UniProtKB/Swiss-Prot annotation, chain A:
It is found in: Nucleus. Component of the 7-subunit TFIIH core complex composed of XPB/ERCC3, XPD/ERCC2, GTF2H1, GTF2H2, GTF2H3, GTF2H4 and GTF2H5, which is active in NER. The core complex associates with the 3-subunit CDK-activating kinase (CAK) module composed of CCNH/cyclin H, CDK7 and MNAT1 to form the 10-subunit holoenzyme (holo-TFIIH) active in transcription. Interacts with PUF60. It comes from Homo sapiens. (Microbial infection) Upon Rift valley fever virus infection, interacts with NSs leading to ubiquitination by the NSs-FBXO3 E3 ligase and proteasome-dependent degradation. This is General transcription factor IIH subunit 1.
Swiss-Prot record, chain B:
This is General transcription factor IIH subunit 4. It holds the Pfam family Tfb2_C. It comes from Homo sapiens. Belongs to the TFB2 family. Keywords: DNA damage, DNA repair, Nucleus, Transcription, Transcription regulation. Component of the 7-subunit TFIIH core complex composed of XPB/ERCC3, XPD/ERCC2, GTF2H1, GTF2H2, GTF2H3, GTF2H4 and GTF2H5, which is active in NER. The core complex associates with the 3-subunit CDK-activating kinase (CAK) module composed of CCNH/cyclin H, CDK7 and MNAT1 to form the 10-subunit holoenzyme (holo-TFIIH) active in transcription. GO terms for molecular function: ATPase activator activity; double-stranded DNA binding; RNA polymerase II general transcription initiation factor activity. One of its GO terms (cellular component) is nuclear speck. The keyword Zinc does not apply. It comes from the Eukaryota. The C-terminus (residues 305-462) stimulates the ATPase activity of XPB/ERCC3. It is found in: Nucleus.
Length: 154, 436
């Protein structure tokens, strides 16, 4: 991969480990052990105890029903979009544009008020993140397909 | 009794002195439960105490009973001591001496347990592992035959006195040989490591009479427990008393030595097994035992609870009958001991089955055991002369308070008490009427 630096490192480590002696004190230290125990203690980095502690009671079911309705709407619209894809006929070219316009209108009509409501109630859950990712993926796929269609005409 | 029970009753100073030897610490750690070992390993490299709640959060709530038992056992063994954490909290930290010795045993450091072995070169009269095993087996067979009372086996006077002090055999009159009691039969039926451990515990208990250091003896025994088989060790570096104790071990077969003044001693397999073979008994569903043994000791042990049928030069065919089991029980051997002995000596072929022994045979033996204890007899005095319930209730309450009551029946106003408390009950009854 790289230059002879890899061989130089191999020779260096071979020479270093040629004269090797076991060690006892240098293996572990009290501070390192305490830090590892704290990390492995409940609520630590590797033992994060939150894991949506009260997700069943957070974001009350009134919002949850609206979130489920938005999920169903997004799923249906994206199902129509992916059924249209791939575009093999000129008729489907305008249908995908209409689907994109409908997706944008739905986003502006619902997600923005939904985001405002979440900000007002200050919910830490990233519920909008999944919908935003799905919409961004659909938009990127449509843009890539349009670019390829333009490239094919060049 | 086991090692933990013996160590529980020792003073903190003795326990601390025991922890000064790395071999003792390893044995104590291995004697710990599975959960305790993980806690010891986690706290091995900690220079600061930990909160009690933090330790308690390691184990789940469902298994909190095991956590409590392990914590109590560790506190009793004084492996760790509670530290007054600043702010009113309680910190848990292992004993510094015990932790240091455990790290030395595991990681390394310090001087070796034995002084040296190559200073004197190879042994001129060194033996092999099979020879050492044969010597240990011969010594153990001689000891057990002397317990039986066979004239072919003769041991030292102090060894015979030790058995008398242990209660296995009683000497009714001086000069006459002692007779083995029921406790002797129970000891014989025990497993060889269990017998060795019980004998060592009795020796430790009686060592106070000789004024020998318990800590030194325990450390030497634990060092012998982890000693490699077939490797000699230096006699030098030990006190005069311990060597004498070692000489007693020479009589027990645990340690083999050519001469008393010799500087080399070879620990044997029995000494290694003290810290903790294939079995030679085949059990059949038709109440028949096939034993692959030739020594008279095993034949006698089997004939204690069974009827012998055939003795081929390398085989013993016996039948387990109701009469033989009843006779063995009358001799003082319980069915559980017989089952444990059969399981320990069970042939490796029988180990293939999911149960070591067939359930039917064990159930039949247990039922035969309950035959003797089917009838309950209680000598005593029966009171049935109660005119009124109130008078009966007061006397019954007084008898219960005295703890001499055997049986009570308020429906018929009849009671039965021990003869010893009969005088007290009569005195109480007389006083109640006279003072009325």
């Amino acid at each position: 991969a790289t230059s002879q630096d890899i061989i130089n490192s191999f020779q260096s480590i071979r020479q270093e480990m040629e004269a090797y002696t076991p060690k006892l004190t240098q293996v572990l230290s009290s501070s390192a052990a305490s830090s590892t125990i704290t990390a492995l203690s409940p609520g630590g980095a590797l033992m994060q105890g939150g894991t949506q502690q009260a997700i069943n009671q957070m974001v009350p079911n009134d919002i949850q029903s609206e979130l489920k309705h938005l999920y169903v709407a997004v799923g249906e619209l994206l199902r129509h979009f992916w059924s249209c894809f791939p575009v093999n006929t000129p008729f489907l070219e305008e249908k995908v544009v209409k689907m994109k316009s409908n997706l944008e209108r739905f986003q502006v009509t619902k997600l923005c008020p939904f985001q405002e409501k979440i900000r007002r109630q200050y919910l830490s859950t990233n519920l909008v993140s999944h919908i935003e990712e799905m919409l961004q993926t659909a938009y990127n796929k449509l843009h890539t397909w349009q670019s390829r269609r333009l490239m094919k005409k060049t | 009794r086991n090692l933990q029970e013996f160590l529980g009753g020792l003073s903190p100073g003795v326990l601390d002195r025991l922890y000064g030897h790395p071999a003792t610490c390893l044995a104590v750690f291995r004697e710990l439960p599975s959960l305790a070992k993980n806690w010891v390993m986690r706290m091995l490299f900690l220079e600061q105490p930990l909160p009690q709640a933090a330790v308690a959060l390691w184990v789940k709530k469902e298994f909190s009973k095991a956590q409590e038992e392990s914590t109590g056992l560790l506190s009793g063994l004084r492996i760790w001591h509670t530290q007054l954490l600043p702010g009113g909290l309680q910190g848990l930290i292992l004993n510094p001496i015990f932790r240091q010795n455990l790290r030395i045993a595991l990681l390394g450091g310090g001087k070796a347990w034995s002084d040296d072995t190559s200073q004197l070169g190879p042994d001129k009269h060194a033996r092999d592992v099979p020879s050492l095993d044969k010597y240990a087996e011969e010594r153990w067979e001689v000891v057990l035959h002397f317990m039986v009372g066979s004239p072919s086996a003769a041991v030292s006077q102090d060894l015979a006195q030790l058995l008398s002090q242990a209660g296995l055999m009683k000497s009714t009159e001086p000069g006459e040989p002692p007779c083995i009691t029921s406790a002797g039969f129970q000891f014989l039926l025990l497993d060889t490591p269990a017998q060795l451990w019980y004998f060592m515990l009795q020796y430790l208990q009686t060592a106070q009479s000789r004024g020998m250091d318990l800590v030194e003896i325990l450390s030497f025994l634990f060092q012998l427990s982890f000693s490699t088989l077939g490797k000699d060790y230096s006699v030098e570096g030990m006190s005069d008393s311990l060597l004498n104790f070692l000489q007693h071990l020479r009589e027990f077969g645990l340690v083999f030595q050519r001469k008393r003044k010799s500087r080399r001693y070879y620990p044997t397999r029995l000494a290694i097994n003290l810290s903790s073979q294939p079995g030679f008994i085949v059990v059949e569903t038709n109440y028949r035992l096939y034993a692959y043994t030739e020594s008279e000791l095993q034949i006698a042990l089997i004939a204690l609870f069974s009827e012998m049928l055939y003795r081929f030069p390398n085989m013993v065919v016996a039948q387990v009958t109701r009469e033989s089991v009843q006779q063995a029980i009358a001799s003082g051997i319980t069915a559980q001991q017989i089952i444990h002995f059969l399981r320990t000596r069970a042939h490796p072929v029988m180990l293939k089955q999911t149960p070591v022994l067939p359930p039917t045979i064990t159930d039949q033996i247990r039922l035969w055991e309950l035959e003797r204890d089917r009838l309950r007899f209680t000598e005593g005095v029966l009171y049935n002369q109660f005119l009124s319930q109130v008078d009966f209730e007061l006397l019954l309450a007084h008898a219960r308070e005295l703890g001499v009551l055997v049986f009570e029946n308020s429906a018929k106003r009849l009671m039965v008490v021990t003869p010893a408390g009969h005088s007290d009950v009569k005195r109480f009854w007389k006083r109640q009427k006279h003072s009325s």
